[PDB]
Swiss-Prot record, chain I:
It is a multi-pass membrane protein. The keyword Cell wall biogenesis/degradation does not apply. Keywords: ATP synthesis, CF(0), Hydrogen ion transport, Ion transport, Membrane, Mitochondrion, Mitochondrion inner membrane, Transmembrane, Transmembrane helix, Transport. It comes from the Eukaryota. The chain crosses the membrane at residues 25-45, 46-66, 84-104, 118-138, 144-164, 178-201, 208-230. It is found in: Mitochondrion inner membrane. This is ATP synthase subunit a.
């Protein structure tokens, strides 16, 4: 298994949907690892895997709430209006 | 029939699970918004008409008489035409509670009726949808309970880059 | 019809608890119902003795609350953090040792911004434990 | 007056007969009002019929002017008798209270029933038609008088205090009239002595400038529902 | 401050006397009175109808100070990002082989 | 008379409240955990399997 | 290169700058009382009334200094 | 810092937590229970007062199509400016 | 999140119940001007201009029970939060403003357009109207900001000076037995003088700040009142 | 409002009124708690905590 | 004679005071209360750790984790939630058993 990189530096150049899905996948992976350890130990899962389940729950709630905007006439108009050639050049020039 | 009580749960669930909102559902909601604005406009027009009809004769003479703000000539012609039309026949001109009732009750009834039947229309629209939202609506009307996490239970479609979770 | 909206609908007799109520009113009226007890917007009375009695009492109970409920939290935090990072570690000390630690905390409070800064800044070359002692 | 179980039983027993009587009175009163309204529209002054606007000098808010928006029909005896006018007035009071109750019912659906139980337990806001015997009518009138007693002193004190605090009479006769106007009912006021107060107050506040709180007190004193 | 008395019909100057941004919009330019905001302001001042200028302003401020200010702060749309996350329009549709429940009947 | 009795009872109640607040009531969220509650969740769902 | 630097002592500098605001406030208050004297020696019968207004002026003028002082505290305790 | 800490309420007793989803759902159930009975018609002002504004607000939320991202209201950590997730 | 807490007035509530079960005359009011708005006789107002008296009196009592008693050490001002004061001032100010706006008299706002007809309407008068409409809201904001800042600054200063006095008193009083006793006595006398001066200043400032808090609200009310003359 | 009441002329008269008796008791507490702190916190056997550099509020609030 | 303050009981006078004396103020206050509980009634865990504790957050026992653990245990037990379901884990039950045997 492999956890995704969701650090601030990695998250900076990522779309919201990808970041949310990666967080959800990481939570699921951690939950299944904890459940596997619990099964190996033989102890009940609820007494060990509650917090990981809650993390999966909260990541699900954040993931399902976001709907990426549809690309339509008004949305495209807004995007083109804000991101003019001058603004694009200024953004490219800025080093920050 | 009271559709709002059924629909409030569905709307809250859709907000919580808005990720699975297809463009068809978005168009449905936009149509609902447009029809709400239309109902507001027509109700306001009715209210203005009732207010004008029940207005006192002296009030109309002051409102639609001299002076003219612009004095273009069309303004005066229109004001005189409306004043003559209103003051020609006899009009019931109540005051106080009576004018309140006459001007408001028709407006309230019209707005409420239009909105209620548009809510019924939206419920039917969501019933006819072939998306996960439509399935949730049908299940809600069948079992009477909102089944959360339905999109991940029946494995509703996801983008090509997010199907790993269904990989089981 | 169920409940009256008028205060005149009495629920008890006129003589119910007359004696205790009269004693309470005597306590209230003796010092307050006087010509020289003219208040400023009902909050500041004119009688000197009201100040003389109430300022000390207010300070006393506020100070007791602060010492035994509010500052105690900071004191316990210092004890726990400086002596193991756990309550059991602190309880491993004796009462005398805890007394010493708490009184040092009081010293730090009294210095505040004017005391020596070596109470919390370790000078170079000092042999005492540092921040990574328990880590 | 406070609510009671005996009055509740009285009004529950006479509820439907009272409603039927109210409907009959409604038909009769509509006829009387139709006659009066036709006469007002036909023979009334131009200002009265056209509802001339009278605005306050401070905030320019319209209100009824006693001179222009009120008209005494001197020749109404030909079409409508005195008894018919009294009937119309009584019906207007009953209809106002019934209208407020009906509005509450329509607004709150079936949740107004317990408030209806509070309503029938008191004769203050029930129509006169709910009384089918002399004793019941006497008790109803007693309730109305009690409400008048409860409300009138506040109205009188409001008027007197505001004037006395912000103005004074011009001459001695006005002073005597103003002082004698607000005497208690145990003494007899001479109307000739008290009349000049009308002009003195016309200088202060005409009916067109009456404040909303004073109006609320007045309507309470007149057994007119205010909510 | 002091009481306001509305002008009489004879005390109101004629419309032709009012001035616009550049000059009076007299005959052959009357229909431009509708578009010239300054001419309308001057006309309102001339007719003592100054509230038409003052009422919309204050209310607007109140509307911003009370209701829209917080709405913009909490629910407004910020500037879009450079790299935009558009919707692929793939989510929501039911999967193949799924048997949807029947509609009410 | 009415106000005297009411204020007598109010004074007794306020006295009890003052004593409890300033001498018995612990402060919430203590660092050591020896006094006061740390808080807990309420209005959690019960008997709603379809909710998850 | 791209460095996220966090300097700590700067909060002192800003704090001091805020205190400079008081240089006006203080001075302003003095001006009021200055005129007050010139107003009491020009019409002493109004002294009490004048005093009241002066106090009002002082309370308004002082208010402003407080604003500045608040900022100082905010930066000095952060 | 220490002087600033002196300006806190001194009589905190208990803190309770509740998710917005949970108590919103409970409130909706209460509202449905009280607005369900037949003796309250849908055209009554009370019913419309209860339902219409909520329906309108929820519709406005659903119709929203924003080009920016609004972070989840109830994240575990909302103090980091450079991490909306 | 729901936090359960209590105000710091319970003992004062007990004293109020004990000392005000019987009636007493009130002759000293912090803001007396709410009772006397009209100074020229024969002037009267049809607007409810005395509606603010009750709220003014209660606000004065509440703020006095908090602010004046806060000079006692360890006494807590439970409401001392910027946004809470914003809510309070918002309530009062916006309530009165909406009372004037619900009157539906647009002429009442004629005075917002500053100046005379000589001044250019678009480039001078309209910009003055914009600034005045802005100034109303700014007056609300300044009122609440001024109330918050005074308390915060005064109590910060008191705390710091008290800390210094405790430090020198506890850790340097031994100099009384030493040869530098005169320096310590000079410093101690200066500290006592500073203590008394600070307490007097805070006592005066609290009352004055309440006076101005009520004066701002009454000024809002007075800006829109119109008085008729009795004839 | 500070209008009137019993006012002792000097220290010896504080015992002529119960309220001033309580006041002088409180003043004794106030002024006598300072000498006690002098003795307690300037004691010869008072020792700083050896672990005072392990943790401090300064690092916590920073 | 009748006066509201002297004759009416306290709840009745309260309603009268805020309905026929200060109705606008009551309306504005209710508006502000709704706004506060709609936009100023949430606190994240990180915010609680930074500012929510009088002397600081006791990481040595982490009460927030215990609180959440109790919350989630209660929810799971009461709602009969199968936390081993593939949606929670992202993998089938058999794969979970294989992982358990591996680790
Ligand atoms: C009396 C009071 C006095 C005291 C006041 C005291 C207070 C101070 C005052 C200031 C207020 C302070 C704020 C306090 C808080 C109050 C609450 C609040 O602010 O909520 C705002 C809050 C803002 O919404 P939101 O929640 O933020 O959500 C934003 C969304 O937009 C929401 O979306 P939605 O789905 O809800 O829809 C909303 C919709 C609302 O609008 C609609 O739904 C549609 C329109 C409704 C019309 C209503 C009737 C009007 C009259 C009809 C005609 C009558 C005459 C008939 C006869 C004609 C004969 C010829 O608006 C829009 O979305 C904008 C659509 C605009 C379309 C424009 C298309 C272009 C062409 C038209 C414009 C350009 C024309 C150029 C012509 C040039 C000619 C040369 O609510 C709203 O504003 C919307 C809901 C309420 C709508 C009520 C509609 C009636 C309004 C009154 C009209 C009449 C009175 C005014 C005139 C008076 C003259 C004397
Ligand atoms: C659960 C239900 C919820 C209900 C919600 C709806 C609201 C409440 C409903 C009603 C509640 C009951 C009480 C209402 C107030 C009663 C007032 C009163 O006593 O009046 C007595 C009075 C009777 O006395 P009167 O002697 O016969 O005549 C009055 C005198 O003339 C008086 O003479 P005067 O000297 O005083 O003359 C002045 C008078 C002159 O006026 C009158 O008296 C005439 C009647 C009013 C005319 C109003 C229309 C004016 C023209 C509008 C043009 C709009 C064009 C827009 C075009 C847009 C194109 C895109 O007043 C004015 O000048 C005021 C004009 C209005 C200014 C409005 C300013 C609004 C600023 C907006 C700020 C921004 C808002 C947010 C942002 C929005 C946009 C994003 O009654 C009336 O005159 C009419 C009363 C009408 C009552 C309202 C009816 C309600 C119907 C509701 C339908 C919708 C229901 C929706 C339900 C939703 C689901 C639950
Ligand atoms: C199903 C939908 C429901 C909608 C929701 C409604 C929610 C509740 C609100 C209230 C609704 C009304 C309740 C029934 C009232 C009774 C009828 C009536 O008007 O009585 C006359 C009476 C007239 O009062 P006034 O002061 O003498 O009037 C001065 C006029 O100058 C008087 O003029 P005048 O001096 O020239 O004399 C004329 C007089 C001469 O007549 C007589 O003397 C004969 C007697 C006639 C009246 C008899 C009334 C009897 C009342 C009791 C009924 C029995 C109750 C039984 C209860 C037990 C049942 C088991 O005749 C009149 O009284 C005629 C007045 C004008 C007609 C008003 C009705 C207009 C609405 C109906 C049409 C709607 C069409 C919809 C079309 C839809 C299109 C899309 O009405 C009242 O007492 C006023 C109502 C009092 C409560 C007010 C509550 C607030 C209202 C706010 C409404 C705002 C707009 C709506 C939205 C609200 C959202 C918040
Ligand atoms: C079958 C029948 C026929 C068909 C139906 C016909 C139609 C009927 C309907 C129409 C009837 C109209 C006439 C009605 C007259 C009677 C009115 C009335 O009430 O009179 C007072 C009436 C007695 O009248 P009365 O003795 O005859 O004296 C009359 C005098 O003339 C004294 O008169 P007064 O003038 O002095 O009294 C007036 C007083 C009337 O008020 C009262 O007297 C208050 C009554 C309640 C007092 C409660 C005290 C006890 C509290 C107990 C607390 C709990 C204790 C512990 C319980 C433990 C349980 C385990 O004040 C007012 O008028 C204030 C009005 C306030 C209006 C509020 C408006 C708010 C608007 C909101 C703002 C909106 C702004 C616009 C926003 C727009 C946004 C777009 O009071 C009572 O009988 C009290 C009843 C108390 C019941 C028990 C306590 C409450 C139980 C609640 C149970 C809840 C269960 C569910 C819980 C669920 C939890 C989840
Ligand atoms: C789960 C754990 C438990 C907690 C559950 C909580 C559930 C919450 C649900 C969700 C709520 C979400 C929203 C919360 C927002 C909170 C906001 C907030 O706090 O703002 C600060 C703000 C601070 O206000 P404040 O300025 O301090 O003034 C309020 C004070 O109450 C003082 O103001 P005031 O003096 O003006 O008040 C009027 C006062 C006027 O003065 C008085 O009446 C004097 C007495 C004052 C009492 C109240 C003060 C309490 C002092 C502290 C506690 C006292 C000791 C308790 C001992 C507990 C021992 C374990 O009268 C009263 O208080 C009336 C009640 C009197 C009761 C008398 C009982 C006598 C019984 C005698 C029995 C005899 C039996 C003999 C048998 C013999 C057999 C042989 O709080 C409020 O404004 C109130 C917030 C309340 C919100 C509603 C909460 C729901 C109700 C919960 C009830 C729980 C009952 C079960 C408990 C069982 C024990 C564990
Ligand atoms: C109208 C104007 C009113 C002016 C009143 C003036 C009062 C003058 C008081 C003189 C000094 C009093 C000393 C009291 C000592 C008490 C015991 C003690 O140790 O206290 C030390 C305390 C604190 O002293 P400290 O800071 O040195 O404490 C040292 C303690 N350590 C080292 C642990 C930190 O003294 C005070 O705080 C007294 C300040 C009083 C300021 C004036 C408050 C006036 C407002 C409240 C009025 C209340 C009236 C209520 C009447 C009823 C209402 C219904
Ligand atoms: C660490 C960060 C610190 C940040 C600090 C920021 C400052 C915080 C200051 C807080 C304290 C001061 C608060 C003062 C009050 C602010 C008020 C405010 O702006 O609230 C606005 C907000 C706006 O509400 P909203 O946010 O829900 O807006 C909904 C808009 N949509 C749906 C598009 C998202 O008001 C409320 O929260 C109350 C709403 C309910 C009450 C009003 C209902 C009637 C509405 C009428 C119009 C629409 C319906 C049609 C007509 C009626 C039909 C019946």
């Amino acid at each position: 298994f492999h956890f995704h990189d969701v650090s601030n530096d990695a998250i900076k150049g990522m779309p919201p949907s990808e970041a949310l899905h990666k967080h959800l996948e990481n939570a699921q992976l951690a939950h299944r690892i904890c459940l596997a350890k619990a099964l190996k130990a033989g102890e009940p899962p609820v007494e060990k895997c509650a917090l990981t389940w809650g993390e999966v729950l909260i990541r699900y709630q954040a993931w399902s709430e976001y709907r990426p905007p549809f690309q339509d006439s008004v949305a495209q108009a807004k995007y083109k209006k804000y991101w003019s050639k001058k603004r694009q050049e200024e953004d490219d020039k800025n080093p920050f | 029939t009271k559709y709002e009580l059924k629909m409030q749960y569905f709307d809250e669930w859709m907000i919580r699970w808005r990720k699975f909102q297809t463009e068809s559902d978005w168009e449905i909601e936009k149509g609902r918004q447009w029809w709400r604005r239309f109902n507001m406009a027509v109700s306001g027009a009715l209210f203005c008409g009732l207010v004008l009809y029940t207005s006192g004769t002296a009030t109309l003479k002051r409102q639609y008489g001299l002076p003219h703000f612009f004095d273009i000539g069309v303004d005066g012609q229109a004001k005189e035409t409306m004043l003559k039309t209103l003051t020609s026949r006899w009009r019931y001109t109540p005051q106080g509670y009576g004018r309140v009732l006459i001007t408001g009750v028709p407006t309230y009834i019209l707005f409420v009726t239009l909105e209620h039947y548009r809510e019924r229309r939206r419920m039917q629209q969501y019933l006819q949808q072939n998306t996960v939202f439509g399935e949730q609506m049908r299940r809600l009307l069948s079992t009477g309970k909102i089944e959360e996490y339905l999109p991940v239970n029946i494995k509703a479609t996801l983008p090509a880059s997010q199907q790993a979770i269904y990989n089981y | 019809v169920l409940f009256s909206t008028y205060r005149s609908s009495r629920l008890v007799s006129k003589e119910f608890l007359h004696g205790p109520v009269m004693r309470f009113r005597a306590l209230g009226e003796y010092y307050f119902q006087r010509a020289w007890n003219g208040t400023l917007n009902w909050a500041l009375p004119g009688e000197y003795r009201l100040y003389a009695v109430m300022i000390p009492f207010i300070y006393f109970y506020h100070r007791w609350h602060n010492d035994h409920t509010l500052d105690r939290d900071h004191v316990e935090k210092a004890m726990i953090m400086r002596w193991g990072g756990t309550l059991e570690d602190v309880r491993k000390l004796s009462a005398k040792d805890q007394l010493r630690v708490r009184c040092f905390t009081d010293i730090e409070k009294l210095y505040s911004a004017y005391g020596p800064k070596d109470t919390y800044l370790q000078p170079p070359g000092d042999t005492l434990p540092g921040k990574d002692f328990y880590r | 007056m406070q609510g009671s179980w005996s009055v509740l039983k009285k009004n529950c027993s006479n509820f439907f007969p009272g409603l039927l009587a109210f409907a009959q009175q409604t038909q009769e009163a509509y006829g009387i009002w139709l006659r009066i309204y036709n006469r007002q529209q036909k023979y009334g002054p131009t200002d009265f019929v056209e509802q001339s606007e009278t605005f306050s000098p401070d905030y320019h808010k319209r209100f009824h002017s006693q001179d222009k928006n009120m008209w005494v029909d001197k020749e109404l005896c030909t079409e409508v008798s005195q008894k018919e006018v009294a009937r119309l007035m009584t019906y207007k009071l009953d209809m106002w209270r019934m209208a407020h109750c009906a509005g509450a019912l329509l607004a709150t659906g079936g949740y107004a029933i317990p408030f209806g139980l509070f309503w029938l337990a008191n004769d203050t806001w029930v129509p006169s038609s709910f009384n089918l015997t002399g004793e019941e009518l006497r008790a109803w009138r007693e309730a109305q008088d009690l409400y008048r007693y409860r409300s009138a002193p506040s109205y009188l004190t409001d008027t007197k205090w505001h004037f006395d605090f912000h103005a004074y009479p011009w001459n001695e006769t006005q002073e005597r009239a103003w002082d004698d106007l607000f005497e208690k009912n145990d003494v007899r006021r001479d109307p000739k002595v008290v009349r000049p107060a009308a002009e003195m107050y016309d200088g202060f506040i005409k009916f067109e400038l009456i404040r909303r709180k004073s109006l609320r007190h007045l309507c309470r004193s007149m057994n007119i529902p205010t909510f | 401050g002091e009481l306001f008395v509305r002008p009489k019909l004879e005390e109101i100057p004629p419309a032709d006397q009012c001035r616009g941004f550049f000059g009076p919009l007299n005959d052959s330019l009357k229909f431009l009175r509708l578009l010239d905001i300054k001419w309308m302001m001057n006309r309102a001042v001339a007719m003592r109808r100054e509230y038409l200028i003052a009422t919309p302003t204050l209310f607007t401020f109140i509307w911003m100070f009370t209701w829209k200010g917080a709405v913009i702060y909490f629910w407004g749309d910020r500037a879009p990002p450079r790299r935009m996350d558009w919707n692929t329009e793939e989510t929501g549709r039911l999967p193949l082989g799924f048997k949807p429940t029947p509609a009410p009947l | 008379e009415i106000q005297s009795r009411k204020k007598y009872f109010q004074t007794l109640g306020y006295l009890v409240a003052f004593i409890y607040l300033y001498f018995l009531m612990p402060k919430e969220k203590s660092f050591s955990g020896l006094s006061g509650p740390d808080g807990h969740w309420i209005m959690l769902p019960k008997g709603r399997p379809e909710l998850f | 290169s791209t460095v996220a630097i966090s300097v700590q002592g700067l909060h002192y500098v800003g704090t001091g700058l805020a205190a400079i605001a008081l240089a006006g406030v203080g001075l302003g208050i003095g001006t009021i009382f200055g005129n007050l004297l010139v107003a009491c020696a020009r019409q002493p019968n109004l002294t009490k009334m004048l005093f009241n207004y002066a106090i009002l002026g002082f309370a308004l003028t002082e208010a402003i200094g407080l604003f500045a002082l608040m900022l100082a505290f905010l930066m000095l305790f952060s | 810092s220490n002087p600033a800490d002196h300006f806190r309420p001194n009589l905190k007793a208990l803190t309770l937590y509740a998710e917005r989803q949970h108590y919103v759902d409970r409130w909706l159930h209460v509202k449905e229970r009280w607005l369900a009975p037949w003796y309250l018609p849908w055209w009554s002002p009370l019913f419309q007062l209860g339902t219409w504004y909520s329906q309108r607000s929820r519709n406005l939320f659903l119709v929203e199509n924003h080009l920016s991202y609004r972070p989840y209201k109830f994240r575990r950590n909302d103090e980091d400016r450079n991490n909306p997730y | 999140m729901f936090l359960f807490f209590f105000c710091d007035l319970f003992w004062l509530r007990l004293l109020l119940c004990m000392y005000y079960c019987v009636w007493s005359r009130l002759c000293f009011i912090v803001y007396f001007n709410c009772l006397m708005l009209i100074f020229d006789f024969l002037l009267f107002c049809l607007f409810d201009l005395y509606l603010f008296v009750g709220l003014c009196l209660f606000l004065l009592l509440w703020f006095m029970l908090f602010n004046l008693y806060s000079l006692i050490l360890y006494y807590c001002i439970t409401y001392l939060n910027l946004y809470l004061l914003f809510c309070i001032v918002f309530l009062l100010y916006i309530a009165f403003l909406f009372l004037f706006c619900f009157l539906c008299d647009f002429f009442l706002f004629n005075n917002l357009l500053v100046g005379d007809s000589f001044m250019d309407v678009f480039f001078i008068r309209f910009l003055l109207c914009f600034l005045e409409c802005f100034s109303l809201l700014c007056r609300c904001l300044s009122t609440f900001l001024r109330l918050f800042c005074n308390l915060l600054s005064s109590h910060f200063l008191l705390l710091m000076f008290f800390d210094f006095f405790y430090f020198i008193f506890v850790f340097f009083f031994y100099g009384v037995f030493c040869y530098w006793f005169i320096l310590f006595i000079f410093v101690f006398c200066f500290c006592l003088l500073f203590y008394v001066f600070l307490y007097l200043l805070d006592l005066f400032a609290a009352i004055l700040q309440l006076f101005i808090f009520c004066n701002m609200i009454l000024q809002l009310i007075m800006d829109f009142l119109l008085f008729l003359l009795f004839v | 409002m500070l209008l009137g009441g019993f006012v002792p002329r000097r220290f010896s008269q504080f015992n002529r009124d119960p309220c001033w008796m309580f006041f002088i008791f409180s003043v004794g507490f106030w002024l006598g708690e300072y000498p006690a702190m002098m003795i307690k916190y300037n004691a010869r056997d008072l020792v700083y905590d050896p672990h005072r550099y392990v943790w401090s509020h300064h690092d916590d609030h920073h | 004679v009748y006066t509201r303050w002297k004759c009416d009981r306290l709840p009745v006078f309260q309603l009268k005071l805020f309905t026929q004396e200060y109705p606008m103020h009551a309306a504005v206050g209710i508006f502000t209360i709704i706004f506060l509980w709609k936009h100023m009634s949430h606190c994240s865990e990180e915010t609680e750790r930074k500012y929510g504790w009088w002397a600081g957050y006791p990481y040595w026992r982490d009460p927030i984790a215990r609180r959440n653990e109790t919350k989630y245990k209660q929810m799971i037990i009461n709602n009969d939630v199968d936390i081993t379901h593939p949606k929670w884990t992202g993998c089938s039950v058999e794969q979970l058993e294989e992982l358990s045997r591996v680790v």
